[PDB]
Amino acid sequence: RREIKIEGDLVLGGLFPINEKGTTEECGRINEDRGIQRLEAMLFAIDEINKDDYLLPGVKLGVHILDTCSRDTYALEQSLEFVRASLLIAGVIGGSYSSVSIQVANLLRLFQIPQISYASTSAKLSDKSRYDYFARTVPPDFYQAKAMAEILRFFNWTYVSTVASEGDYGETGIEAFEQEARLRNISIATAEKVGRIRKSYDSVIRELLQKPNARVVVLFMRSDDSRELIAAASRANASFTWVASDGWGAQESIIKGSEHVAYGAITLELASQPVRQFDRYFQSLNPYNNHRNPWFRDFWEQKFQCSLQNHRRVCDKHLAIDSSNYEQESKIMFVVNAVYAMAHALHKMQRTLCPNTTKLCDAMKILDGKKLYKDYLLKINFTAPFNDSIVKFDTFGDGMGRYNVFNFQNVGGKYSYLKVGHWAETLSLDVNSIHWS
Template sequence: MAEILRYFNWTYVSTVASEGDYGETGIDAFQQEARVRHICIATSAKVSRSMSRWSYDAVIRSLQQKSNAKVVILFTRSEDARELLVAAARMNATFIWVASDGWGAQESVVRGSEPVANGAFTIELASYPIKEFTQYFTKLDPYNNTRNPWFREFWEHRFQCSLQEVSCGQYSLSDGSFEQESKIMFVINAVYAMAHALHNMRLAACPNSTKICDAMKPGTGKRLYKDYVLKTRFDAPFRPADTENVVSFDANGDSLGRYNIFHYHGDDGKYVYTKVGHWAQDLVLNTSHILWDQQAPPTSQCSDPCRKNEVKSMQPGDVCCWICIPCQAHQYLLDEFHCTDCMLGQWPLENLTGCYELPEEYIQWGDAWAVGPVTIACLGIICTLFVIGVFAKHIDTPLVKASGRELSYILLLGVLMCYSVTFVYVAKPSATVCALRRLGLGTSFAICYSALLTKTNRIARIFGGVRDGAQRPRFISPASQVAICSALISCQLVALLLWLLVEVPDVRKEVKPDRRDIVILKCNSKDSSMLLSLTYDCLLIVLCTVYAFKTRKCPENFNEAKFIGFTMYTTCIIWLAFQPIFYVTASDYRVQTTTMCISVSLSGSVVLGCLFAPKTHIILFQPQKNVTTLRAPTARFSVTTGPPSSHSQTSGSNFVPTVCNGREVLDSTTSSL
């Protein structure tokens, strides 16, 4: 019975037992088996023959109070089972009955209560009729069966007559229908088991006698049971030829159980018992013979099954009633009672039995977020290389010399690196890419603004010296300017290398705060650390801007300071706008990366456009302006327009620079900045 419940997952049932050894012992054994299989008893009731019809109604009412326990276990006598069905019909109660062999397959139990009994599972001991007993019993009459004192009473009741009448003794039990009791086989087997035990005991205790000896006298019953009855084993007599039935007992004195399982249901307008399986140490059911009203087995559970994303919250000591608690979206089911978080970068499988690695998301080269910055960077690189080519081709012209060839090439290198940074930021993050991001961003700015700071400082010192009539300023030679610029760049490089040592570059996986199934692959450096690394570049920009402002009143024809000033003012605006935009777009890595790339390219474009575009235009389209003029030593800040003369050199303590189209050439015989 317990295995039938487990088969259909009926884990919450009620029980009814008849008072007495049969019902109470049977229901106790069932409850033990039910506990092993985690089946809970909702309510238990007992019935007896002395109960009134109202008492049976009370039992049905108590069963109805446990509405989730739709299955009722009956371990009752046939009469009690019949009364319960009648009471259920009166109260319009519907249950799935699972009954012991007290109900079995008897028609008398369900007669008149067929609709209420519909769907019941009943159990009956597996037996077969013994035709020899039928022949023996049907030949009995009151005259040849004087051994049974109740047989005469049975005869008179059977034929509704009195044996005082001569005709009463002329009836025969073979007349009419005769249905052999299904348990006759077990009675015969029990008699034969005792006979075998006594026979074996006599052979052992009285080997030299064919009669009962003293060793078999009263008082040896315990020995008979323990040493002989329990050890008896023989083939059952009178069994059909195709049937195997060995009679034996276990250590508790129980014989091996064999049961047939019946399902009571309606078929073509009538109700019948259909054999749907059997049990012989294991349950075998043929569910194709089981007909359900709803095309599926009903449920009998204290709590509804949890959904696939829910776990059971149990009360202590309760195995049948629970509360379903949903798991979080990022959790999987460790078992039916526990949710467990997936590791970072993982997401639950569809069936929630585990986790799988999420695909890493980063900007792809073909994304719209990458196409724009990459296009700008490519155009910038082409323009920068074009300017480098123009300057290299016209390297000995006065305008290129006046621009400061060495610093111009360093500055163009910084601009080229600014554009190249875009490709590093669009590339898939890795330890190498992350290291290049840290080095490339700060270094490219440091190269640009170190060169500009060196240039503006030189201009300020030169024209400051001219105004004051001072001697030629120190450290304005090309080698000195390159050394100063390199020293400024080295400060940034040292800081970046220390950062790489303190915080080793690597990648990290970032999951959205709402735990969506998206893993973003990023470098492990923080945004604040990245902006902190640009502090030195900001200092260079501020100093460049200050020097550009100081040199704004240089001679009108010296327009180098004007272009540098315009470059720095524009750069300041870009940087002031960049930092808040960078933090505002931090929630979307694609927007933030695109903003970063465009801002860096824009900074390089400002330098390229404001400083080098006018010079390139003069070199290519206005070569007549690419000439050298000299300042008169007697006229302060005046520029002569006559041809250059070797006698127009600085003399004494006064230093007057040579100019080309408004740009000073410190020494026309040397390669200067």
């Protein structure tokens, strides 16, 4: 029922997991980082573009923002509002979960509405024919498989074993790693999978022990699966050199109480830099100055376990989002770059189709989505506005594969993940900073 509907000459649709997938109820609690923060980054980006005197000087961007409630079917129903509009919906920003972005993309292509996801990393969305109106500022996860294969090939690690989670993430990732290993003459000792139980991980650990020549284990697993496998490795006192995808990444929750077996592990994470101006914008928001966001009062009441309006404690008027209770969500840069990619494509389109004017001409009021996607959006190339990193898409509409390389080690009586490298198209490692086990 809730929405953010702001008028403009051109309107961008937005889809965010503002609320978690509910349990009795369809929608759960507010999602603070993937929902509120990401939605406010798109509003921040719109405000900035509208303020800019060089980008779309005569065209004001409006918005139509909706909650996906972290569910495919709910997001599809919401997306009908963007299709009914045929508000001048020029394109859609979102969603977050790949399963939501797949269903939205199946609908939007039918009405030729371009879509840019700032978070969906499934390999399926790369399909030029099935998702011919979809683009993304994030790279697909199959580039992690390529980056891991390139890390092994560098260290000449020719004999390895693999563990994968069940589902799109784990299966597609190890299937891509298997192919990337074959091309690099890397032989896979044993390939294990993990379904949806404590014993299951011990069966995998035992099966990994059956090939003692393969000291390197390559993981393409979800967070919970990664923690549980390292726990079973801890129980069996089985120490391996783990090479893992972002499912493990640089999360301290994974290695907690199992740092011996997990020592020297090589992990990947999506490389991103914070948007400093966003921290200032987000920390200044309060229930008194943020009337345009209809979810903000529930976000505030939930974040601070208080009531703004008697069994509930009254919100102290001096509460604030600040350094002690806030950290910029890892994908804020991708939200901002997605909105700017749409603006840059629209700007170039208006300049070509509306000669000798800055205003939105008739040729663009009857907007050709096919032209916008193929001839403008897929051909954008600009410097990220708050970074010199380039925003651009390949012919599949995929953003550039840039990952940080981490090494789990202890220096100065503290266990931390250390940034020991980066993968862009070529691997770059600071080898003399890596610890082994």
